[PDB]
Write a protein that binds this ligand. Structure first.
Ligand SMILES: [Co+2]
Ligand SMILES: [Co+2]
Ligand SMILES: [Co+2]
Ligand SMILES: [Co+2]
Lengths: 331, 331
């Protein structure tokens, strides 16, 4: 099929290099810990309880392994609580393999002030390129822990000029190292534009996963994106009818259509769940309880897969999505 | 004149309570360390060199004392690098008294994602109120170091709904504790609106300093703001013709007019300087060199004051601005 072509390094997890064959079933987009930009400024009342986060996270890790999930890809942006050392902790404690990311979030929800300022003063793209390259090849913050993927994100109405700085830096790092790229699309838009842009810049589509594609329910939009040869992920499975999100029933309808059209090799599945929130614990209005009810990392293993199988999807298609595709994209 | 009326606590500096009479000459708006939101996500290439920052900061501290400045008010927002423990370090090492702030920055340049999200889920104002109240009365991040002022900020075109959450929480904390409030106005606008809003909410104008008023060169705008009984600060003195900023000559023209109209008791002067930047050191395009040439904390002491005196301003007016006003506002 379409194999990764160009520079290449074996999958880097927070605990070191891992062979593609050892990745096993994988959730390509989750967040062990996560905090929206600003969470740190609420440190007095919402401090990080490391002991509790570690207990809870490892328990979630252990439950994933119970389900045969050997690997999780943590997509947390550098300014949203990324903590490679903590992920290494969670990994060494449970045996769950974790890959972390390098990247900043979309303009609308990221810690954008910094690079927007540096971009006004000089060559920010080049500076973003050096950070990503260093994090992928040498390590994050002096820990030696390397990023196994680059995380890119765009806004709803366009991939903004600020966002494009990151897309150009990542493309260059991609070309030079072969590292995988995973993305965020805001509210079901810009999937095709991200794929076009990344490929146009020389990024290997065999190493690109356009995310939150489940955010759009017109399969035409998905096919237009797949036309580029990149993989696409229904990665907010379980987050229903909230923040623009469709219902899982809607996602499944699109998914089985795409599956029935032969796209298994290019479909990945995830929850975009957060195991432990940073800042003060989120206050969940009762009315939103159903929207987040299945939004946890065991939902696909326990509800989705069995539901695709009973719908006609095959053990082979499911293994392609959950093991085949990840092995090739990140391995 | 107009003395602080209501609840009251003695000036809290990062090293403890200080009598109003011991504040001495003060710079009401500076930043020992500062980083635009996102700086932390650039930690791999732009890590904090604590030894160098401490050496440099204390040297700046020592130079301020050489000039008789006994106190500095650090206006750094919770998500812009605020570090009470480091300020205590700089203070205990030199004897320079430092007050730190509690508050988030304006929507356009702050770490806004967090509270914008919490506001969508619940009562963020109340949450912001608890943080500010706890930081002012008990301490920041478990250090015991209390905030001596609340920092509020608004955008250019309006005090946005997100910003108003902070203005309402601060007003309440102001009413209950008497703590001073200092603000940021973006590009010479919203000074009058901030003053109106804060007073309308029950905040004591004798404890309110509307900042970056030097950003507007129409004295009419300043008088309209002073009409509220609040103090106003020309606090970006030295930052010239850049980021919308006027020249110092322009600021001085407005200042002597206001001074000649009897407003000394309500005028404060500062630089809004940054002693040590967080993130990778700022790259200064040569063309901007003159704009930042006098932008350091010795500029007012060495250039401005002597320049107001030779312009006719009196030793008494200068002492009112630099010692009288601070004593009353923060003491
Ligand atoms: Co996302
Ligand atoms: Co995510
Ligand atoms: Co400001
Ligand atoms: Co400032």
């Amino acid at each position: 099929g379409d194999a990764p072509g160009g520079a290449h390094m074996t999958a880097q997890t927070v605990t070191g290099a891992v062979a593609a064959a050892q990745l096993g079933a994988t959730l390509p987009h989750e967040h062990v810990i996560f905090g929206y930009p600003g969470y740190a400024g609420d440190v007095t009342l919402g401090p990080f309880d490391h002991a509790a986060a570690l207990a809870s996270c490892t328990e979630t890790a252990r439950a994933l392994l119970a389900r045969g999930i050997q690997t999780v890809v943590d997509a947390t942006p550098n300014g949203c609580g990324r903590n490679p050392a903590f992920l290494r902790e969670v990994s060494e404690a449970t045996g769950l393999q974790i890959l972390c990311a390098t990247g900043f979030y979309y303009e609308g929800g990221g810690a954008t002030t910094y690079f927007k300022f540096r971009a006004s003063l000089g060559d920010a793209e080049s500076e973003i390129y050096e950070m990503m390259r260093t994090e992928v090849t040498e390590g994050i913050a002096g820990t030696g822990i390397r990023a196994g993927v680059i995380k890119l994100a765009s806004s709803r109405d366009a991939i903004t000029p600020y966002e494009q700085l990151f897309f150009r830096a990542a493309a260059r790092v991609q070309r030079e190292t072969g590292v995988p790229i995973i993305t965020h699309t805001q509210e079901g838009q810009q999937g095709p534009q991200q794929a076009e842009l990344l490929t146009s810049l020389g990024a290997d589509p065999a190493r690109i996963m356009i995310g939150h594609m489940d955010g759009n329910t017109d399969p035409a939009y998905h096919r237009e994106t797949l036309r580029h040869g990149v993989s696409i992920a229904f990665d907010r499975i379980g987050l229903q009818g909230i923040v623009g999100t469709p219902t899982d029933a809607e996602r499944l309808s699109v998914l089985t259509t795409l599956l029935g059209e032969g796209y298994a090799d290019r479909l990945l599945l995830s929850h975009d769940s957060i195991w432990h929130w940073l800042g003060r614990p989120p206050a969940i209005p009762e009315a939103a309880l159903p929207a987040v009810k299945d939004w946890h990392p065991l939902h696909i293993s326990d509800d989705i897969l069995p539901d695709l199988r009973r719908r006609g999807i095959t053990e082979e298609q499911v293994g392609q999505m959950t093991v085949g595709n990840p092995a090739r994209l990140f391995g």
